[PDB]
Every structure is written in C-alpha cells, then in structure tokens.
Write a protein that binds this DNA or RNA. Structure first.
Lengths: 133, 17
RNA sequence: GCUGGGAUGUUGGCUUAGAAGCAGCCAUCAUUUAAAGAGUGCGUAACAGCUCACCAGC
C-alpha cells in the first residue's frame, strides 16, 4: 500500500509518479488515466491518493481532500510556507477562510464540531507562517 | 544525480537485487 | 513485567535528488481520546519496519 500527493489532472511522469509505486508492482499507465479520471471533478488542486496493490499487482486507490498546508497556501494566495514559521509570517487568511478549509477537509478530519475542525486547520496554518484575521 | 533505487525526483530508484 | 493500543489534520512549514516523528533550520498547534510527542533511539535512498513516551487490562 503506497500513498502520494498527485496533482488533479496529471500523472505518468517518471520522477513524480513512475519509480515510486512503479517499484511495488503497480502498472503506471492504468493509474495515470484512472487517477486523472475522477480527479477531473476537482482539477487544479493537489490531492493525496492512497494506492493499494494486491499480491496480483492489481490495485485500487482512495482519493482524499487536498492537504491543509496546500489549501492554506492557496487561500493566503502564496506559493510557499514561511521558511521560519511564527518567526516570519509570509501570508494570512480570514477566520472565515479557516472555516472554508475546515469544511472542505471535514471528510478527512476527525473533529466532532466545525469549531474543532477549524482549530485543526489553524494548527497547520500556525506551522507554515500563515496568520488568521 | 545518478544511482540505482535511490532518489525522489530525477529518475532512478531501484530495480533489482 | 506481560499483553494490547500508541490514533486524525499530516509526508507540519522550509530545505533537499529525497528529507514522510528521527541530516538540517523553523514551528511544536489542533483533533479524537483511556492514551498517544508534529516524537526516544535503531532503521530506509526516501518510505516501510522495530523501539520509546503515553494509556489500558492482568
């Protein structure tokens, strides 16, 4: 069982994909087209998928919501997180934005309340030099 | 920049043993 | 002491070919918890895997 974060509508490259699971038994081509199939509904974003390979080299994979750090980057309109979180703020997002992301990632979050969800997201923002306003 | 089995971003990795 | 658990965002941000708790720098929050560090050491190319913290039962 392998896991990785592949961009929406794109796959097959050797450096990014290939070698990775391609060395566990997986047949790249089938995944590239397959992944890029459903990753059509949500394109442009980087989404993490969990590939599972059965003894017979066959496989399946679940597509999850994009990473918090990623959504956060997007929200703050930045490209990278601070090189020194807290010491240097490189961006910021509104409390409502935290709410949006928390809502977006909810299926993958284990919070029992939207409040707890936002607290989770804020923890990530605090780790990448992104402030909340 | 080269090897067999051993990196994440250029292209080698592994492949026997 | 023994057994079982040791979870979720998440491979935290940066860096890097990679850097996924564990080269290095910064941060070290939040969730679900009975409990579980943005992780004690081993380990991998990076993962994996083993181990410790912590909790539970005996």
């Amino acid at each position: 069982q392998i896991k990785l974060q592949l961009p929406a509508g794109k796959a097959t490259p050797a450096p990014p994909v290939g070698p990775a699971l391609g060395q566990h038994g997986v047949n790249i081509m089938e995944f590239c087209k397959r992944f890029n199939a459903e990753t059509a509904d949500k394109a442009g974003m980087i989404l993490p998928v969990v590939i599972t390979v059965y003894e017979d080299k066959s496989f399946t994979f679940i597509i999850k919501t994009p990473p918090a750090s990623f959504l956060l980057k997007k929200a703050a309109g930045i490209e990278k997180g601070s090189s020194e979180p807290k010491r240097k703020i490189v961006g910021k997002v509104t409390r409502k934005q935290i709410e949006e992301i928390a809502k977006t990632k909810m299926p993958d979050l284990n919070a029992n309340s939207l409040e707890a969800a936002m607290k989770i997201i804020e923890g990530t923002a605090k780790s990448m030099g992104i402030e909340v306003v | 920049i080269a090897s067999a089995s051993c990196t994440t971003x250029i292209c080698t990795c592994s492949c026997s043993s």
